[PDB]
């Protein structure tokens, strides 16, 4: 429980609670997605209907998002309704009801919809397959529930009171004064949570290099390469991402997307080329890796990546202050590969 807020002379505030409860820490896979779709539901005091209706009358919006590390519980409101939304987030963190009748009626159709939507895009399948072949059972659990390993309600309850502990979470927000937020987080039921162990471990999560996965998929074809990066070499790969998907290169017309996912311990630099034809995916990814295996100079992209990382670390509550000035060049070594779609007309890892 670290309360970290800041002030501004505006009208609309947000209060967020971040727990370390993504699919990095899921016991069975898809449990964190069920908890994330499970979050803003029936409390033991009031309903999921009474909370939504009286908060709409009070003028705010609840949300709960899920990525690989955190579960984010966000609440956006008008500025003079801070203690009600603090008490609402504390209510929903402490005493959710966990009923099977709402597990089957409301949680599982939303999970099935979110899984079908994330399946029908051919680039998210390549991204989580790239995670699953880079990190085996650390960060490489799948993000969404899909009915492979059957998740009960008791597993969700066990994971929920494993992860919803006081040392694990921290509370941030925009446009709230720190004194009233620290006074409302106490005199509450967010302070009376079980003071369990914090779940993050800080040594690097044991990656695997030189591995390939080939996924068969009808539709449009992608080819993705992925480099697990350390904590020291995070700046060079961030400069590489903002250099590759930018107009400084001649490789921006080939690469459809390229991004570095950052964490506490290390990160993963991923690169997707997507097309509807597949000989263009083969020739494009062959040109991309055959030009990246020679040495690229990355110092022209430094000011541009300082801009892009300022504007992307604008509204996040986890700012990593990278230096970006020990960066001079890049030469690709070994890299994981995943090819999704028309898989017989796509090159293998020996061909690249």
């Amino acid at each position: 429980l670290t309360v970290s807020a800041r002030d501004a002379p505006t009208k609309i505030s947000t209060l967020a609670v971040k727990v370390h409860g993504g699919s990095r820490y899921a016991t069975k896979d898809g449990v964190a997605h069920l908890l994330n779709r499970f979050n803003f539901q029936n409390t033991n005091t009031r309903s999921a209907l009474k909370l939504v209706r009286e908060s709409e009358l009070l003028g705010g919006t609840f949300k709960s998002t899920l990525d690989r590390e955190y579960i984010t519980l966000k609440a956006t409101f008008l500025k003079d309704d801070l203690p009600y939304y603090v008490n609402a987030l504390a209510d929903v963190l402490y005493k959710t009801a966990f009923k099977p009748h709402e597990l089957t009626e409301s949680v599982l159709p939303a999970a099935r919809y979110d899984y079908a939507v994330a399946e029908q895009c051919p680039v998210k399948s390549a991204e989580d397959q790239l995670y699953a072949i880079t990190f085996r059972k650390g960060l490489g659990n799948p993000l969404l529930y899909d009915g492979v390993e059957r998740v009960s309600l008791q597993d969700i309850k066990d994971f929920a009171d494993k992860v919803y502990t006081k040392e694990n979470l921290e509370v941030s927000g925009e446009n709230v004064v720190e004194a009233d937020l620290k006074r409302f987080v106490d005199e509450s039921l967010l302070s009376t949570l079980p003071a369990g162990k914090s779940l993050v471990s800080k040594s690097e999560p044991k990656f695997f290099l030189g591995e390939e996965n080939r996924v068969r998929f009808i539709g449009d074809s992608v080819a993705a390469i992925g480099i697990p990066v350390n904590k020291a070499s995070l700046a060079q790969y961030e400069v590489l991402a903002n250099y590759l998907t930018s107009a400084l290169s001649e490789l921006s017309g080939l690469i459809s997307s390229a991004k570095l996912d950052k964490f506490t311990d290390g990160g993963l630099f991923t690169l997707f080329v997507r097309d509807q034809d597949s000989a263009v995916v083969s020739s494009n990814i062959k040109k991309i890796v055959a030009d990246l295996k020679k040495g690229k100079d990355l110092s022209p992209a430094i000011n541009y990546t300082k801009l892009k990382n300022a504007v992307q670390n604008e509204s996040v509550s986890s700012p990593i202050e990278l230096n970006f000035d020990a960066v001079k060049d890049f030469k690709l070594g070994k890299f994981n590969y995943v090819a999704v779609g028309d898989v017989s007309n796509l090159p293998y890892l020996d061909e690249l």
């Binding site: 009358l57 009070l58 003079d80 309704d81 203690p83 009600y84 008490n87 009233d180």
Partner: protein
């Protein structure tokens, strides 16, 4: 300031309707009552009891309904 609750209370209802329904409906419903009474006013003009009682007490449309037949020219 800081509002810690919601200071609001239920209305007067019977499930299907409420008082806010009838309050906003009642001028058009009294107009519908007037239109219904006008409709059967025009539908029962040939009824002789309502004809001689009400439909000649109208000021200027009155003498058009009666027609002045002398009493020594009707069969009954």
């Amino acid at each position: 300031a800081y509002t810690s609750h919601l200071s609001s209370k239920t209305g007067l209802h019977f499930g299907r309707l409420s008082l806010r329904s009838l309050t906003a409906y009642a001028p058009n419903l009294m107009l519908w009552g007037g239109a219904s009474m006008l409709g059967l006013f025009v539908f029962t003009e040939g009824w002789p009891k309502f004809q001689d009682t009400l439909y000649k007490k109208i000021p200027l449309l009155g003498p058009t309904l009666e027609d002045h037949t002398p009493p020594e020219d009707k069969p009954n």
